[PDB]
Symmetry: C2
Subunit: 140 residues, 2 copies
């Protein structure tokens, strides 16, 4: 019964070596199956798109929690590593490792901030209980 | 062991930048105007929408290849929305619309239901994200 704050539409065609675009034209992407799976590579793929979206979403959640908590964040960057695995049921699944690099906090402060961000990020909430996510954080 | 692994690094906030380490994906970001930003660049909801549409289309073709089902064509639309929650902040919801050429409606529904089981995006969000699935045939 809740109203969408934002909606975006994407259309894909042409298979794993095809093409995908958002209706508003802001994202227009060629696709290719990676060399590691016997493809030609040379373009992006859904695992990269998920890794990129997750890194950016989680960085935003760190910044949001720090702003709400009045935490003295100087900078943050976010690394996501996304792996594809085969399932016993002949499907596929993702696994994820996240690594935050946070400036301005001591190591313990940063670990608590990242933990809170993990509860707020919409990607993290979308995959809870389904995807194993490993978190690490470094300060500098 | 992993079939495939990739790494992305994001920096600069909602109006920042994200890249994969192999350089195949390099993107400026922006907060959409609907959320108070300026738009003019993509965002994590569009990335998810695009990856889900491509991933689900690949799952349809994969199941069809395994089941020896001749497909004349497939295209995939995904629609991704953000909703405000009282508790956990914002939440994703998804509508998927497959367009399949060469199968009648019952055959296409069966194929799309199986694809939904195989697609890694679907299995990632299963039960946390409402996913409405529809199929049209031509
Ligand atoms: Cl759009
Ligand atoms: Cl990479």
């Amino acid at each position: 019964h809740m109203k969408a704050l934002y909606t975006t539409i994407a259309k894909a065609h042409g298979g794993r070596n095809g093409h995908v675009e958002t209706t508003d034209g802001l994202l227009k992407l060629d696709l290719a199956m990676p060399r590691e799976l016997g493809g030609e590579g040379g373009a992006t793929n859904p695992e990269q798109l998920f890794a990129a979206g997750y890194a950016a979403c989680f960085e935003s959640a760190i910044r949001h929690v720090a702003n709400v908590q009045k935490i003295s964040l100087e900078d943050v960057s976010m690394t996501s590593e996304v792996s594809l695995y085969a399932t016993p049921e002949k499907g596929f699944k993702l696994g994820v490792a996240l690594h935050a690099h946070i400036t301005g906090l001591n190591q313990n402060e940063a670990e608590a901030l990242v933990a809170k961000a993990h509860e707020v990020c919409p990607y993290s909430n979308a995959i809870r209980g389904n995807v194993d996510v490993k978190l690490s954080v470094s300060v500098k």
